[PDB]
Design a protein around this ligand. Structure first.
Ligand SMILES: CCCC(=O)C(=O)O
Ligand SMILES: CCCC(=O)C(=O)O
Ligand SMILES: [Ca+2]
Ligand SMILES: [Ca+2]
Lengths: 329, 330
């Protein structure tokens, strides 16, 4: 007889986003199915029991046993957490999964989460993000000066160096903030989530690419001690379920964003590519931010150099095995 | 008490093909771990209990309960099985997973396997394959006329329409055949597997891309009646373990191929892009082959048109959300 385990999972997400909230639900449903009801986890939307941006805090305190969040929400505690979500001009979703599972990423991220009493598992990806929504159209790089924009992580810091006034909001809050006039622009994920949250209603000017988040990972987090007290069978169920959340969510976003792109263009939204004045300035600002973080911390520097090497090698591989068919019509 | 289930899994793979055999091992180990030993599956290498090309036949007959194979080994039984692995100029591994899980592909493939008493689950990908190994560099499309090349499946049929003299050889045999002068060229999967077979020693010209296999799926198969007999808990364990095999294998190949590519370029291998004359002729010959299959069968035609639509839409999406960052090299 294995125990009846009953857990709660705090998430960073609103229930309306069945893509990303769906990853948390998948983990909870699958351990219940595999355990025949002996191992249950109740998922909660952002703000129900824990604020969306404080999932790691609640997991560390053990006010919940586990969570579903984005590591880059905690760059204030350790800028190295950025690599476990996405960094500007960083890894594709497929490269990010390769880096986590076989390039040393999951070991690097678990070493950081160990400092906050937690263990981490990849448990979602949005795939490549788009460039966000603007109430007024962008004319050139100088159009960004003084804009109030919702955008998190090191992407936010890059946009701040370009003169954007970066605002902190969980996904659920963006539409009201855009309507009330609190902000002038926002990015979230892509067509499917952006349209569902009402971003295409609040703003008409959509850009690409989302160079800040080329393949952002969502992590399942478990309290170290809660994880220790789990029998080996239930650890295996949870760990395996997170692979389904990770591959299942990426595939779900690819499908839903592909349909939503067609829907919003038919409904009147025009998608524009960012000018090279913005892309060049973003790349340069990103290099400056990573240089500063590296000079301030040998651990960050060492991780940045291992990740940069992984990135160079995997891009060289994908330039041969994938890019030629992607660009040939 | 849930039952003590003991199954056997027939695989299409030698144990030396370890990244792919590893997918089968992952499923077997993970259901044993999650069930605390109550659900065990014993994996077998190709030939040990069932020939590698007869996994589906063995699963249908229930001589084994489950299998790990490539749907495109069964195109002689139904050419529609091709889409469940890879087709020339088809889907990237990421697009292939999107198509299977959400685009209707798993439902299409399960309707085909239902004819043979089987249910199917995605359970691996090699990722994009390369264009194979050539002793002498290719000058142009006419250089392929009469060239003796190891290349199997629909890829071989396309290369045949380009005038290639298609040679059938096992993985293990290609090195000797290249050295002996028996064949002029050969493809397998990519740098990791190809280096282990000695192909970097036998030839200096490695072509790309492998337009015949842009993201080949490996499928777990279960006998429909064996699956029916399985408690709901063990079904969930098996189905979930196949997601780990699928994402795990692709990521493992990406890592191994990226490392092996660096080793073989240091060993003086030249990476050559196929000329547009070959890529245009191959795309056209592939479209002719799929046209003939479609004209001979309304069910094939319908599936080809659903897949072509999914492919157009996903490519349109990836041209926006991925290609811009992928094509700028620093
Ligand atoms: C990582 C998914 C959520 C996100 O991209 C964001 O909060 O912007
Ligand atoms: C998917 C493995 C089979 C193959 O690609 C080959 O033998 O060439
Ligand atoms: Ca975002
Ligand atoms: Ca091959």
């Amino acid at each position: 007889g294995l125990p009846q385990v009953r857990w709660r999972m705090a998430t960073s997400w609103p229930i309306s986003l069945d893509t990303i909230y769906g990853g948390a639900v998948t983990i909870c449903q699958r351990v219940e199915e595999m355990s025949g009801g002996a191992f249950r986890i109740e998922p909660f939307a952002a703000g129900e029991i824990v604020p969306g941006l404080e999932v790691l805090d609640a997991v560390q305190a053990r006010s919940v046993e586990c969570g579903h969040t984005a590591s880059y929400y905690y760059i204030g505690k350790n800028p190295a957490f950025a690599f476990g979500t996405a960094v500007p001009f960083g890894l594709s979703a497929q490269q990010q999964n390769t880096w986590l599972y076989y390039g040393g990423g999951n070991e690097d991220m678990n070493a950081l989460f160990a400092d906050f009493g937690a263990v981490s598992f990849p448990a979602g990806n949005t795939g490549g993000q788009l460039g966000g929504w603007f109430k007024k159209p962008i004319q050139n790089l100088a159009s960004l000066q003084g804009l109030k924009m919702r955008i998190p992580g090191l992407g936010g810091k890059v946009m701040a160096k370009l003169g954007v006034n970066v605002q902190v909001l969980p996904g659920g809050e963006i539409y009201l903030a855009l309507e009330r006039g609190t902000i002038d622009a926002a990015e979230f994920t892509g067509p499917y989530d952006d349209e569902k949250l009402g971003l295409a209603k609040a703003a008409k000017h959509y850009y690409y690419p989302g160079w800040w988040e080329p393949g952002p990972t969502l992590m399942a987090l478990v309290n170290r001690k809660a994880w220790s007290d789990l029998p080996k069978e239930y650890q295996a169920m949870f760990r395996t379920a997170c692979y389904e959340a990770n591959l299942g969510m990426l595939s779900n976003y690819e499908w839903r964003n592909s349909e939503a792109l067609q829907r919003i263009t038919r409904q009147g939204i025009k998608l524009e590519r960012y000018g090279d004045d913005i892309l060049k300035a973003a790349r340069s600002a990103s290099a400056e931010i990573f240089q500063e973080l590296a000079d301030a911390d040998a651990g960050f520097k060492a991780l940045l150099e291992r990740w940069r090497l992984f990135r160079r090698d995997t891009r060289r591989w994908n330039n041969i095995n994938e890019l030629p068919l992607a660009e040939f019509d």
